[PDB]
Amino acid sequence: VKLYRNGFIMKPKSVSPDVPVSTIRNIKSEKGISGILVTEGGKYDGKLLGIVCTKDIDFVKDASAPVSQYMTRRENMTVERYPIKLEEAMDVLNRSRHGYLPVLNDKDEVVCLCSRRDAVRARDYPNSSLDRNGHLLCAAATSTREADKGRVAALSEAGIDVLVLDSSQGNTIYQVSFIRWVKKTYPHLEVVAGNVVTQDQAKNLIDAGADSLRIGMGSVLACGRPQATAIYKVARYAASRGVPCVADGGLRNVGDVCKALAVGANVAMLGSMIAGTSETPGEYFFKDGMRLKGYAVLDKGSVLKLLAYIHKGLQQSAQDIGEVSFDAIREKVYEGQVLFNRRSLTAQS
Amino acid sequence: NTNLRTKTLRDGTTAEELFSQDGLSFNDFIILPGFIDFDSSKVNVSGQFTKNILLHLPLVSSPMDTVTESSMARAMALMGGIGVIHNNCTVEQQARMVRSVKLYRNGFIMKPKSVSPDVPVSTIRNIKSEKGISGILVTEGGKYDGKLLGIVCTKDIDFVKDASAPVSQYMTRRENMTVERYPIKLEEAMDVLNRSRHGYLPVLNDKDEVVCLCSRRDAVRARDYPNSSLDRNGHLLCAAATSTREADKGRVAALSEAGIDVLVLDSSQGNTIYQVSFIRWVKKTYPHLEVVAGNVVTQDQAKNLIDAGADSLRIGMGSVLACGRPQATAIYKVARYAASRGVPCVADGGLRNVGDVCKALAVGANVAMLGSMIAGTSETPGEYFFKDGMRLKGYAVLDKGSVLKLLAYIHKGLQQSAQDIGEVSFDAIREKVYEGQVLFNRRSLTAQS
Amino acid sequence: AVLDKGSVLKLLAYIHKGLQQSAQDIGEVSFDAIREKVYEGQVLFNRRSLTAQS
Amino acid sequence: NTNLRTKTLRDGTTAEELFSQDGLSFNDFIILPGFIDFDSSKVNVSGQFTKNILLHLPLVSSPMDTVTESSMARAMALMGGIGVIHNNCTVEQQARMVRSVKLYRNGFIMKPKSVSPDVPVSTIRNIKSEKGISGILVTEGGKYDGKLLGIVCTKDIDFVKDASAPVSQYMTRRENMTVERYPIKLEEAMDVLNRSRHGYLPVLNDKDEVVCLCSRRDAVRARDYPNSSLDRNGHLLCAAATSTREADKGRVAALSEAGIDVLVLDSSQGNTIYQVSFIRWVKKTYPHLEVVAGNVVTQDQAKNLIDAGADSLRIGMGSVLACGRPQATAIYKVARYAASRGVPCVADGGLRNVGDVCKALAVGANVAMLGSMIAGTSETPGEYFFKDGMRLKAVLDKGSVLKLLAYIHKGLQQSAQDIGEVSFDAIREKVYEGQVLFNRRSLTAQS
Ligand SMILES: Nc1ncnc2c1ncn2[C@@H]1O[C@H](COP(=O)(O)OP(=O)(O)OP(=O)(O)O)[C@@H](O)[C@H]1O
Ligand SMILES: Nc1ncnc2c1ncn2[C@@H]1O[C@H](COP(=O)(O)OP(=O)(O)OP(=O)(O)O)[C@@H](O)[C@H]1O
Ligand SMILES: Nc1ncnc2c1ncn2[C@@H]1O[C@H](COP(=O)(O)OP(=O)(O)OP(=O)(O)O)[C@@H](O)[C@H]1O
Ligand SMILES: Nc1nc2c(ncn2[C@@H]2O[C@H](COP(=O)(O)OP(=O)(O)O)[C@@H](O)[C@H]2O)c(=O)[nH]1
Ligand SMILES: Nc1nc2c(ncn2[C@@H]2O[C@H](COP(=O)(O)OP(=O)(O)O)[C@@H](O)[C@H]2O)c(=O)[nH]1
Ligand SMILES: Nc1nc2c(ncn2[C@@H]2O[C@H](COP(=O)(O)OP(=O)(O)O)[C@@H](O)[C@H]2O)c(=O)[nH]1
Structure with a gap:
């Protein structure tokens, strides 16, 4: 990624x-x-x-x-x-x-x-995400165990700009220690802690020195939280402390991405939405007269066309909302100038 | 790490607020996560079956003729739980099953x-x-x-x-x-x-x-089986069910001779004068016996049966008759009242997966009763047969294999859930739920997809 | 068209027994008593969430 | 290894017996296996599109406005097949598409x-x-x-x-x-x-x-693309469709100027006086052109259209609704009669997977026409759009038609291998000879 x-x-x-x-x-x-x-x-x-x-x-x-x-x-x-x-x-x-x-x-x-x-x-590609040397930005995931320390070093040598901690429940002592150690050893690295869904958890991981938080847990285990509420709450608390948040999960169409960004998330994480595009890993195969990907999902073609589609969708949504930027939408949401309506179960048909 | 574990922002909903409106089932809410500083293996899931009986494994086999006979009760006791021998049989058969469990x-x-x-x-x-x-x-x-x-x-x-x-x-x-x-x-x-x-x-x-x-x-x-539920003489614990009629008195004596450690009253609606009299008479005649009264779903009913001298309460009614109560609300309310009076409660009904068992234990139940969840395991009564290329049990249900593997699966699940919640025991989870430090979120109907 | 339910007498007796058993579970020996105690706040209810109806 | 390959017990049913009763579709029968002494890589699937045009890949893109324009025809010709530019357009647009294909x-x-x-x-x-x-x-x-x-x-x-x-x-x-x-x-x-x-x-x-x-x-x-279907000057082969009306004469001329090598007559029922006259006029005025007449399903229609001077026949009718014929029977009958007179046949319809294409080629068809199977590939006309997270053009995106053509190629090769012959010309010959055998499948036997 970095030397392309x-x-x-x-x-x-x-x-x-x-x-x-x-x-x-x-x-x-x-x-x-x-x-x-x-x-x-x-x-x-x-x-x-x-x-x-x-x-x-x-x-x-x-x-x-x-x-x-x-x-x-x-x-x-x-x-x-x-x-x-x-x-x-x-x-x-x-x-x-x-x-x-x-x-x-x-x-x-x-x-x-x-x-x-x-x-x-x-x-x-005039909008490419670049570092200061003209290389493309790249992030990499890692767990917070003791062995993963090695991994971090290696990734730091490879030139990652963001480290992303991988955990279903990120409010742990191991992750707090890991964030402290990463910020201490590799100050140039930025860390996205998580995953979290409550403002407790967010407080601990931001105190540890997190530069961003991944929101999502559940989008049989009895523990988690509905994703929109989680995003709003955690993103509000983190913004009060100057930390952006990533919405991770339950994002299945463009309306959901727009809503998640409007209620506090700064950026959105895509998994299912982009799985099966040409750029994902895996081999293509034909089956039942359908093109699928395997180590199954349907071929969605180029991820670039999909990203441009999502871009245009977000733009049109922001226009209909009446604001010329999503930072503006977030500010005006916190200010009470961008308004919502809860929909009855019947009203969703 | 009390600074890290203690919630001060308290972003979430406490149990008291959650159950203050309409009656809820277990899918209507979810538990919010806390702080983790331990491995799930170190989690203690134990719960009180009665005032004096602690179960390393907070699981009880339901006293249905399709679930609990001697073999199932033995398996349960061995894994750290307990089984209730059903009462759809003669006094002699029930005493023989109890003896099978006790002298194994x-x-x-x-x-x-x-x-x-x-x-x-x-x-x-x-x-x-x-x-x-x-x-x-x-x-x-x-x-x-x-x-x-x-x-x-x-x-x-x-x-x-x-x-x-x-x-x-x-x-x-x-x-x-x-x-x-x-x-x-x-x-x-x-x-x-x-x-x-x-x-x-x-x-x-x-x-x-x-x-x-x-x-x-x-x-x-x-x-x-290092966690076997045992009495003081090294025998496996055993419970037995009985109705509260006058004839059943005989039954009780027989079971007492067979060596039961817990008597369990069988009733869809246990807040009756017959059950109150029966509990009084049992505690008077057989003081060594502990009695699980029920079934109940309201704090009225719980008061009467605890005043009678109940050592534990079975919660559940409805999990065409117009009378009953959503099971999660019933559990929370009755278990809170009973705990205020020092009595544990058993969740009985509507328990169909591990998340539901974890939720039921977190909101107040000390132990959980399993019926449908374990029906069709090798240790239940009934004969196996093949049909439509499927193994089934009959006097039908699908073969779930050994109940021991299932109990270990539920154990590991409860441990992982408690870990995600951030507490190293379920007694701790109950205490912190009553304290407002373990928090919940009610889920909209849409949020359950 | 409708399905044969047999004698209405057997059906009425079935409903009678059902109402009796329900009143028993509620803890009152008459439905006039149930109505009075409902107005008095001694017979109580619980609203059921949409999920709780399964 | 002729001793091992030659069937003497002949445990199975010959094509003539199979198609002697009621009209069959491709699911009603299966081909019995033979003797293998070769790799599937060595299998020749080529078939005659017309008396003089051999296709390394026996696949033709259907002349539907939703399937074949310049890009599709180019892809087909490049992979060893050919495409038929549809006639749902002006003469000038069709000639421009043909020119694009020919001068690519x-x-x-x-x-x-x-x-x-x-x-x-x-x-x-x-x-x-x-x-x-x-x-x-x-x-x-x-x-x-x-x-x-x-x-x-x-x-x-x-x-x-x-x-x-x-x-x-x-x-x-x-x-x-x-x-x-x-x-x-x-x-x-x-x-x-x-x-x-x-x-x-x-x-x-x-x-x-x-x-x-x-x-x-x-x-x-x-x-x-070493197997591209080419003419003598190094250009890609291209076919174009036309109706048989009097106005279409003009159309034909234009296409001839654009450089088509095959004309394909567009009709649900090609056994008409207008089509006979049209074929005669085309062979007389533009002798260099080869004509694929059709559509036909019976040997009488084929007799008339071959007497007119057809170089190939399009098989298919039904694959209001009271006239037609089950497609496998139609293919077998018409292709056998036409082969007796030295004319190859194109299977047009009901070809929905590789097994069906293989069966259609084995029972007499030299080449197969693809419509639905390639609809929604990148090379078809139309714009892509997103809906319900699926990308559609409506049909679902099947990606490049080239990869799909290679898939069909490998499928035909492996099937021919299992049948025990190293080419589909051999398969057709041995089918007529009774050495490649079949089994009709009861309705239950289909799963
Ligand atoms: N700095 C250079 N000086 C002299 N010749 C060069 C230089 N850079 C490239 N060439 C030569 O230009 C000629 C044509 O370039 P070539 O097309 O092969 O690759 P390219 O420039 O990267 O573009 P493309 O691969 O898309 O065709 C080659 O012989 C190459 O060696
Ligand atoms: N206390 C004892 N003194 C002498 N012999 C004994 C004693 N207990 C058992 N045995 C004998 O040991 C021999 C082997 O034991 P055996 O295998 O038959 O049963 P087990 O000891 O219960 O173990 P298992 O049934 O699993 O094989 C038997 O002949 C048995 O009578
Ligand atoms: N006959 C020629 N004599 C001198 N220079 C030429 C000649 N033909 C092309 N060039 C120049 O060399 C370069 C041509 O590169 P090339 O022909 O490979 O481009 P292309 O066909 O458009 O595709 P690509 O360059 O991406 O491979 C250009 O700078 C062009 O001006
Ligand atoms: N010749 C050439 N090298 C490039 C180009 N772009 C990047 N590189 C360099 O080519 C190298 C890729 O090979 P390399 O990483 O050394 O091999 P590896 O150790 O096995 O990964 C990197 O050092 C890149 O920086 C290019 O366009 N042309
Ligand atoms: N020989 C032997 N006896 C055992 C063992 N385990 C338990 N027992 C006793 O064997 C007896 C079982 O038979 P019993 O109850 O007398 O017959 P019942 O009256 O028909 O139920 C019980 O008294 C048990 O205590 C064992 O391992 N070996
Ligand atoms: N300069 C150049 N011309 C090509 C190439 N390939 C094909 N051509 C010619 O480019 C012409 C394109 O068609 P043209 O008549 O100019 O446009 P039209 O009038 O709209 O059909 C054709 O005559 C082709 O023969 C190429 O690679 N380079």
């Missing part, structure tokens, strides 16, 4: 000259990156020798041939010398009509790499 | 089953097949207190082809038997039994007459 | 899309988004044969914010272009294009005017 989008591509995937074309095809097929640099000994910081792109090997019949036979050789490559501002480098890339632009030191060793694909990703 | 587990086995030397092996096989006891003593004239002559065990007759042969032909003879002389402490006797690698150890007087008997099977039962 | 894949592109230098970038973006072609040539006056001035590709305009700018500002200009001079063999031209690492190679005369254009995308399409 970059400005300057650090540690660019590179190979040695004797590598077979089969390896470059494998790189493109599994990991999906082109423009492989060919360097001294394949080290990502070695002397730049060449580059291998899509059109350089799409015609070759002997997949065992070395890339040096078909790579574009360094003397013929447009390159840049460190230092360079990303803005100038990407304008150079644009003017060059090429897909990639390496940046080298005085010894022709590979310092970094600019990809036109990143420019086009930025153009086609 | 012993320390010293009094009146050990014994036979005379001329008895055929067929008789010993019958004893093992019907009543399930081995290690039959062979004595003078078959009297259980006669001179000890020998012992007959499983391996002594499992190879014999002439079932008419006398046991004296194959019994282990007394001169070769490890025995003990009265007096002896049970501890020393059972250690001797262990060291001897044998299954049985008789205890005799100076005349070699049988005083009593120790069984290794009792040691292994104690090891495999 | 080329060797030499003879009429390469061209623009004049003053055209805005927005127009090239529109071309790429609507028609899906890049490497637009910029020539004198925008004529596809004018003097070559430059070329516009993806990376030449992906960064510009002023969409009204002329292409002359950003195009790759002629002086810097790798080009070739007419004449040149396609083999050498495309190898040169490969070595050049570019996406396009114009071919010009001595006057620098555009003769034609080679596209790397065509090479890669040939590599990724």
